Design a protein around this motif. Structure first.
Motif, PDB file in Angstrom:
ATOM      1  N   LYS A   1      -8.911  -9.473   0.106  1.00 26.95           N
ATOM      2  CA  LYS A   1      -9.541  -8.143   0.033  1.00 26.95           C
ATOM      3  C   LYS A   1      -8.601  -7.013   0.476  1.00 26.95           C
ATOM      4  CE  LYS A   1     -13.086 -11.206   0.986  1.00 26.95           C
ATOM      5  NZ  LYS A   1     -12.864 -12.298   1.980  1.00 26.95           N
ATOM      6  N   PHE A   2      -7.297  -7.267   0.618  1.00 26.89           N
ATOM      7  CA  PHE A   2      -6.318  -6.258   0.969  1.00 26.89           C
ATOM      8  C   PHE A   2      -5.049  -6.541   0.158  1.00 26.89           C
ATOM      9  CE2 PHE A   2      -8.404  -4.380   4.754  1.00 26.89           C
ATOM     10  CZ  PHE A   2      -9.268  -5.376   5.185  1.00 26.89           C
ATOM     11  N   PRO A   3      -5.105  -6.305  -1.166  1.00 27.93           N
ATOM     12  CA  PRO A   3      -4.007  -6.741  -2.026  1.00 27.93           C
ATOM     13  C   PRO A   3      -2.647  -6.151  -1.666  1.00 27.93           C
ATOM     14  CG  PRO A   3      -5.866  -5.882  -3.319  1.00 27.93           C
ATOM     15  CD  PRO A   3      -6.089  -5.484  -1.891  1.00 27.93           C
ATOM     16  N   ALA A   4      -2.659  -4.986  -1.005  1.00 25.65           N
ATOM     17  CA  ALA A   4      -1.435  -4.327  -0.562  1.00 25.65           C
ATOM     18  C   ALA A   4      -0.649  -5.187   0.434  1.00 25.65           C
ATOM     19  CB  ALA A   4      -1.771  -2.977   0.044  1.00 25.65           C
ATOM     20  N   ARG A   5      -1.277  -6.223   0.990  1.00 23.14           N
ATOM     21  CA  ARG A   5      -0.616  -7.105   1.941  1.00 23.14           C
ATOM     22  C   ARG A   5      -0.407  -8.505   1.378  1.00 23.14           C
ATOM     23  NH1 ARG A   5      -1.110  -4.876   7.176  1.00 23.14           N
ATOM     24  NH2 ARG A   5       0.318  -6.474   7.868  1.00 23.14           N
ATOM     25  N   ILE A   6      -0.748  -8.733   0.105  1.00 16.45           N
ATOM     26  CA  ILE A   6      -0.524 -10.054  -0.522  1.00 16.45           C
ATOM     27  C   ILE A   6       0.935 -10.464  -0.348  1.00 16.45           C
ATOM     28  CG2 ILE A   6      -0.430 -11.288  -2.758  1.00 16.45           C
ATOM     29  CD1 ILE A   6      -3.087 -10.235  -3.463  1.00 16.45           C
ATOM     30  N   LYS A   7       1.882  -9.625  -0.792  1.00 11.02           N
ATOM     31  CA  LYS A   7       3.300  -9.977  -0.627  1.00 11.02           C
ATOM     32  C   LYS A   7       3.675 -10.099   0.825  1.00 11.02           C
ATOM     33  CE  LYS A   7       3.474 -10.510  -4.941  1.00 11.02           C
ATOM     34  NZ  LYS A   7       2.573 -10.026  -6.013  1.00 11.02           N
ATOM     35  N   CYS A   8       2.998  -9.347   1.697  1.00 11.40           N
ATOM     36  CA  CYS A   8       3.179  -9.562   3.131  1.00 11.40           C
ATOM     37  C   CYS A   8       2.926 -11.025   3.484  1.00 11.40           C
ATOM     38  CB  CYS A   8       2.342  -8.639   4.005  1.00 11.40           C
ATOM     39  SG  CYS A   8       2.844  -6.919   3.909  1.00 11.40           S
ATOM     40  N   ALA A   9       1.767 -11.537   3.078  1.00  7.76           N
ATOM     41  CA  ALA A   9       1.442 -12.936   3.345  1.00  7.76           C
ATOM     42  C   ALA A   9       2.258 -13.884   2.459  1.00  7.76           C
ATOM     43  CB  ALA A   9      -0.049 -13.181   3.166  1.00  7.76           C
TER      44      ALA A   9
ATOM     45  N   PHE B   1      -9.257  19.087  -8.548  1.00  2.00           N
ATOM     46  CA  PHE B   1      -8.555  17.806  -8.561  1.00  2.00           C
ATOM     47  C   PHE B   1      -9.588  16.685  -8.505  1.00  2.00           C
ATOM     48  CE2 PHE B   1      -4.044  18.913  -8.075  1.00  2.00           C
ATOM     49  CZ  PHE B   1      -4.109  20.251  -7.688  1.00  2.00           C
ATOM     50  N   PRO B   2     -10.002  16.159  -9.686  1.00  2.00           N
ATOM     51  CA  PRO B   2     -11.131  15.214  -9.714  1.00  2.00           C
ATOM     52  C   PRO B   2     -10.912  13.977  -8.849  1.00  2.00           C
ATOM     53  CG  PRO B   2     -10.645  16.008 -11.900  1.00  2.00           C
ATOM     54  CD  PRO B   2      -9.495  16.434 -11.043  1.00  2.00           C
ATOM     55  N   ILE B   3      -9.656  13.518  -8.802  1.00  2.00           N
ATOM     56  CA  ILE B   3      -9.284  12.275  -8.112  1.00  2.00           C
ATOM     57  C   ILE B   3      -9.552  12.354  -6.601  1.00  2.00           C
ATOM     58  CG2 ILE B   3      -6.866  12.877  -7.809  1.00  2.00           C
ATOM     59  CD1 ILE B   3      -6.295   9.889  -8.763  1.00  2.00           C
ATOM     60  N   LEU B   4      -9.625  13.564  -6.067  1.00  2.00           N
ATOM     61  CA  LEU B   4      -9.849  13.722  -4.640  1.00  2.00           C
ATOM     62  C   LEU B   4     -11.286  13.398  -4.244  1.00  2.00           C
ATOM     63  CD1 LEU B   4      -7.947  16.970  -3.643  1.00  2.00           C
ATOM     64  CD2 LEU B   4      -7.095  14.589  -3.672  1.00  2.00           C
ATOM     65  N   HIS B   5     -12.220  13.575  -5.174  1.00  2.00           N
ATOM     66  CA  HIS B   5     -13.646  13.452  -4.854  1.00  2.00           C
ATOM     67  C   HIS B   5     -14.168  12.063  -5.200  1.00  2.00           C
ATOM     68  CE1 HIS B   5     -13.152  17.804  -4.646  1.00  2.00           C
ATOM     69  NE2 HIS B   5     -12.701  17.728  -5.883  1.00  2.00           N
ATOM     70  N   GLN B   6     -13.730  11.092  -4.404  1.00  2.00           N
ATOM     71  CA  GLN B   6     -14.200   9.730  -4.507  1.00  2.00           C
ATOM     72  C   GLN B   6     -14.180   9.063  -3.138  1.00  2.00           C
ATOM     73  OE1 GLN B   6     -11.551   6.809  -6.544  1.00  2.00           O
ATOM     74  NE2 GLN B   6     -10.088   8.517  -6.603  1.00  2.00           N
ATOM     75  N   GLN B   7     -14.744   7.865  -3.079  1.00  2.00           N
ATOM     76  CA  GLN B   7     -14.759   7.049  -1.876  1.00  2.00           C
ATOM     77  C   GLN B   7     -13.779   5.890  -1.980  1.00  2.00           C
ATOM     78  OE1 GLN B   7     -17.623   7.213   0.822  1.00  2.00           O
ATOM     79  NE2 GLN B   7     -17.192   9.277   0.085  1.00  2.00           N
ATOM     80  N   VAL B   8     -13.189   5.518  -0.850  1.00  2.00           N
ATOM     81  CA  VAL B   8     -12.339   4.350  -0.728  1.00  2.00           C
ATOM     82  C   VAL B   8     -12.773   3.620   0.531  1.00  2.00           C
ATOM     83  CG1 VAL B   8      -9.978   3.557  -0.233  1.00  2.00           C
ATOM     84  CG2 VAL B   8     -10.328   5.250  -1.984  1.00  2.00           C
ATOM     85  N   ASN B   9     -13.314   2.411   0.366  1.00  2.00           N
ATOM     86  CA  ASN B   9     -13.826   1.568   1.482  1.00  2.00           C
ATOM     87  C   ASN B   9     -14.876   2.334   2.299  1.00  2.00           C
ATOM     88  OD1 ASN B   9     -10.548   0.605   1.409  1.00  2.00           O
ATOM     89  ND2 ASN B   9     -12.096  -1.002   1.319  1.00  2.00           N
ATOM     90  N   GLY B  10     -15.828   2.921   1.582  1.00  2.00           N
ATOM     91  CA  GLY B  10     -16.918   3.688   2.172  1.00  2.00           C
ATOM     92  C   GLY B  10     -16.516   4.951   2.925  1.00  2.00           C
TER      93      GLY B  10
ATOM     94  N   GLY C   1       4.041   0.690  -2.038  1.00  2.00           N
ATOM     95  CA  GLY C   1       2.997   1.565  -1.533  1.00  2.00           C
ATOM     96  C   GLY C   1       1.961   0.589  -0.965  1.00  2.00           C
ATOM     97  N   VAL C   2       0.972   1.130  -0.269  1.00  2.00           N
ATOM     98  CA  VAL C   2       0.132   0.299   0.577  1.00  2.00           C
ATOM     99  C   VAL C   2      -1.338   0.711   0.514  1.00  2.00           C
ATOM    100  CG1 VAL C   2       1.696  -0.828   2.241  1.00  2.00           C
ATOM    101  CG2 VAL C   2       1.206   1.643   2.435  1.00  2.00           C
ATOM    102  N   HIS C   3      -1.662   1.744  -0.256  1.00  2.00           N
ATOM    103  CA  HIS C   3      -3.041   2.219  -0.307  1.00  2.00           C
ATOM    104  C   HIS C   3      -3.728   1.805  -1.596  1.00  2.00           C
ATOM    105  CE1 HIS C   3      -1.644   5.587  -2.771  1.00  2.00           C
ATOM    106  NE2 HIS C   3      -0.673   5.738  -1.889  1.00  2.00           N
ATOM    107  N   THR C   4      -5.043   1.935  -1.606  1.00  2.00           N
ATOM    108  CA  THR C   4      -5.905   1.397  -2.669  1.00  2.00           C
ATOM    109  C   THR C   4      -5.531   1.924  -4.057  1.00  2.00           C
ATOM    110  OG1 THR C   4      -7.737   1.260  -1.053  1.00  2.00           O
ATOM    111  CG2 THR C   4      -8.281   0.914  -3.337  1.00  2.00           C
TER     112      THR C   4
END
Ligand SMILES: Cc1ncc(COP(=O)(O)O)c(CN[C@@H](C)C(=O)O)c1O
Ligand SMILES: Cc1ncc(COP(=O)(O)O)c(CN[C@@H](C)C(=O)O)c1O
Ligand SMILES: [Zn+2]
Ligand SMILES: [Zn+2]
Lengths: 135, 405, 405, 137
Positions: free
Chosen positions: A116-124, B11-20, C55-58
């Motif tokens: 559930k944190f794909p940004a860390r897959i290569k980490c693992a 900027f449409p991309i700004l108005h969303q949720q990420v992990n609640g 990069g590291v974000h969603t």
């Protein structure tokens, strides 16, 4: 929350890694996660067709170093084919996949959460890739 | 001046949720988001008048050609270049710098010549020169940096010699936030018989650029960092230098006459634009320029300086955080938490909806100069607020508490 | 899926030009885009635009998954063995220039030969002109039959043991000929040479199987296959890409960067320097999905049908020469007596019809045809037999208009 | 129709051009239209600051060749860099804007019509583009 990624066993292997070192007459490969903050140098002495001992040296994030510890300790005495099968199981584990729970992973199973944190897959995954280039 | 609410609304991309959590995008130094203006420019292009440009005879072809060349004119005015002949559309800053290294550097380096760069340089402004020197037998030299990550003009005067042919330097560091003295450096380069190549990928989106006042010989920029489409950038070069550089690519559009064995090149700027150009991307970059100009680049700079000062002050009230670079800076902060690797920092921040970058931000030698393996970086742009700085600082504090209780 | 449904997916088709229904017959210059592709770009810029890879974000993860998934789609589309052999470029021109820079200049000495054709697009001529010129090698031309086809005997005569590279277009953009690429690859390999295929004109209209073709290199452009402008593909056999130096240097394509040396990333990223063409590559993947759902075999069958219909209608109009053979792709190059193609194109556009007039970036072919310029109507998946009827009626009005003077 | 902005005199110059030929011992510029297909080889032999004779040979559309013909005849005997002033006036003429009308500006003007059909602007400008490179030091 974040507690479903940084599980207690993971944080224990991060604080107290298991096979720390680079050792002797061996096959020694080194690796770096693309986002250069994870470095590993894997040391494996192979006994004909089995891995008698594996050790590692490194610096990096919690997930990479804990995965290196857990992997090195879960490969002691296992065969090459069993080890590659473990690696394939782990790669499926970090994606969505079902995977074959035949073959113990031990503490390694705890890294399920970084699916559930794909940004860390290569980490693992760094650690295990070191093995797939080892052979 | 800048009404941030109105700005963000576009900027449409700004108005969303990420992990609640409400998205907190602080990675504009990696890439910028796009306003409705730009996206709709692309929509209208592909919906109404897409056709090939220049060589064309029909109505839609004329509309697409007028769009592309009008975008070229918009860029020329945006950076205050003397002539359209000095504006070349490229794939990006990387391609622009590589064109300078291929077409200029390799034709004007012999053994004994020097290329002078900086410790802070982006890889885009390092590796091409590494290759160029190695192909010509020239020498690569590095201007040293002050403790605070700035460059002293004196170190430049010491480093640049009469043997220097090329000085390449980033206008703004994407790691340190330093605004380099490009005008004075151009003068030092010219006093020593050298040209100056400016990596302006990080300055162009956040600051007005005047290439005539800067007197830079080359200037590279990327559209995707200034609210523009991906895949397009600009190379500016003094007309006199472009006249005597060979093209970087060969094919259609860039030729005048073609024999079986030899060919002549088109006049500038088309000399350097081989094949079907990046039509939609260039038109969209022109739209992004219109958008930013209507807001005002100086107003965008003021807003980012306010947020940079606010962020720095809030950061110094966080213990166990090292900030890299000087006090006076652009809209970015590169930092590290003690005993928390930047990957873990980025994972916690993204778990709170905050987007930042982690690693060597494409500046490996600079990371070595700081004796560090990796860093975290929050960057700001016209759509970022003080509230998002508060969310960033509170999330960093949660990261500290989470990893160490 | 019927023709009307297919046209219904292309918004740009449903408008007026000089009070006539648009009749776009210039797809050989560039293709129009279906709703699928444009909305792919919309969704990218509206939802998940961020930089890709490190990069590291969603949002970054979403954008990276999109870019690399597009690479996989291209690989399957052209049946390349591995993703390592699919390189995203600016277009066919850039792809061919990369081949000429990285391969040709590293493998030509005096005595070596590069073998091309009289029919070649400028993109597949000038780079080789330059490469031979920098290496001291020799450029040689495969002659053409009077009908504008290639004879396998002519290539066996032209190709010798001294030949290192054979470069040839898969389909001529002027003649409509489909060249025997497979047999030519066989002849090239028998003489110790590699083959480079310009597939700009084939990829949009017919299935591509690089494994069956056994071509060493293959170049294509997105803007000609219902995809976004500014992106293309270079395919090369893995073994050859392994031993070619990168064409550009910068971020993304490196492994380690020191002050004086750097190591390269593995394929395919070795050849993708800087922020890649993110949205364009994702949109090209969307265009590939669209074309696959329709079926390249149905698109090829449809274009042949219209090519045959057009030829049969064409020569039963007097005073038009069509160039090239009976069996052809979906395009017709022609001339009306005593009316320069520019005037023809203006009259046709006055009846809302879009065609190209002049050279078509193939000057030597124009010299070989003993003509200064030609007119060209090209067809694609959205064109009808009715639009062919409108074209012939407009050609007749053109003749009658230029006789009343 | 609207295509009757293909002016009657223009068709005379495409039909029977004026200054077709070569001009030796002089300034030779050669140009091709960006919109490929129009070729001009413009040759001017000059008496100091004036063009004593200007001739051209080429192949191309009605507008390009006719503009070259009308050009060579309206530019036989031209004065100073007023020729460049004519060029700027012509360029404004093709962008629709009005000019400083009647500095002789012999003949042509019928090319006013391709302020419409912008796809042909380049056709008409070819000749004049040659002139501007002819004088370029
Ligand atoms: C200072 C600087 N220089 C040069 C470049 C290279 O530009 P393109 O990748 O657009 O060609 C970048 C891009 N930035 C990314 C790689 C970053 O460092 O965040 C940059 O920030
Ligand atoms: C056979 C052929 N080869 C190569 C190219 C170069 O493609 P890009 O410019 O997209 O890279 C083209 C483009 N087509 C146009 C020029 C035409 O046929 O008129 C082409 O038709
Ligand atoms: Zn990590
Ligand atoms: Zn013309």
């Amino acid at each position: 929350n974040l507690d479903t990624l940084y599980r207690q066993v993971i944080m224990d292997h991060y604080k107290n890694p298991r096979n720390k070192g680079v050792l002797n007459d061996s096959i020694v490969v080194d690796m770096n996660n693309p986002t250069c903050g994870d470095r590993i140098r894997l040391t494996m002495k192979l006994d004909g067709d089995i891995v008698e001992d594996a050790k590692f040296e490194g610096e990096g994030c919690s997930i990479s170093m804990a995965s290196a510890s857990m992997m090195t300790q879960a490969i002691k005495g296992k065969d090459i084919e069993t080890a590659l099968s473990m690696s394939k199981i782990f790669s499926d584990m970090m994606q969505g996949k079902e995977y074959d729970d035949s073959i113990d992973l031990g503490d390694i199973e705890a890294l399920q959460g970084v699916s559930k944190f794909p940004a860390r897959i290569k980490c693992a995954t760094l650690s295990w890739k070191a093995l797939e280039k080892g052979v | 001046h800048m009404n941030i609410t109105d700005i963000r609304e576009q900027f449409p991309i700004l108005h969303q949720q990420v992990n609640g959590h409400d998205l907190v995008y602080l990675d504009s130094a990696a890439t910028s988001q796009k306003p409705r203006a730009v996206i709709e420019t692309l929509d209208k292009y592909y919906n109404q008048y897409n056709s090939n440009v220049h060589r064309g005879v029909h109505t839609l072809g004329t509309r697409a050609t007028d769009g592309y060349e009008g975008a070229r004119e918009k860029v020329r005015k945006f950076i205050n270049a003397k002539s359209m002949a000095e504006i070349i559309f490229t794939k990006g800053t990387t391609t622009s710098l590589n064109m300078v290294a291929l077409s200029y550097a390799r034709a004007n380096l012999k053994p004994g010549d020097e290329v002078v760069i900086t410790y802070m340089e982006h890889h885009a402004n390092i590796i091409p020169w590494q290759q160029a020197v190695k192909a010509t037998g020239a020498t690569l030299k590095y201007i040293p940096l002050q403790e605070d990550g700035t460059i002293s003009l004196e170190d430049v005067r010491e480093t640049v010699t009469s043997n220097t042919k090329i000085v390449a330097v980033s206008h703004v560091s994407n790691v340190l936030g330093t605004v380099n003295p490009i005008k004075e450096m151009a003068k030092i380069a010219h006093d020593n018989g050298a040209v100056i190549v400016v990596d302006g990928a990080q300055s162009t989106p956040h600051m007005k650029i005047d290439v005539q006042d800067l007197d830079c010989d080359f200037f590279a920029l990327s559209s995707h960092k200034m609210c523009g489409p991906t895949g397009v950038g600009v190379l500016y070069g003094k007309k006199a230098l472009l006249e005597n550089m060979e093209p970087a690519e060969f094919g259609g559009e860039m030729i005048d006459f073609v024999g079986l064995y030899e060919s002549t090149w088109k006049e500038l700027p088309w000399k350097f634009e081989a094949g079907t150009p990046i039509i939609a991307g260039a038109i969209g970059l022109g739209a992004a320029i219109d958008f930013l100009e209507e807001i005002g680049l100086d107003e965008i700079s003021r807003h980012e300086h306010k947020l940079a000062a606010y962020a720095l002050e809030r950061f110094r009230q966080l213990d166990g955080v090292t900030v890299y670079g000087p006090e006076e800076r652009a809209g970015l902060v590169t930092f590290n938490l003690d005993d928390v690797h930047p990957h873990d920092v980025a994972t916690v921040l993204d778990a709170e909806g905050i987007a930042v970058r982690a690693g060597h931000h494409c500046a490996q030698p600079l990371m070595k100069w700081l004796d560090v393996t990796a860093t975290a970086r929050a960057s700001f742009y016209l759509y970022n607020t003080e509230e998002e700085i508060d969310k960033l600082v509170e999330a960093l504090q949660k990261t500290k508490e989470y990893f160490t209780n």
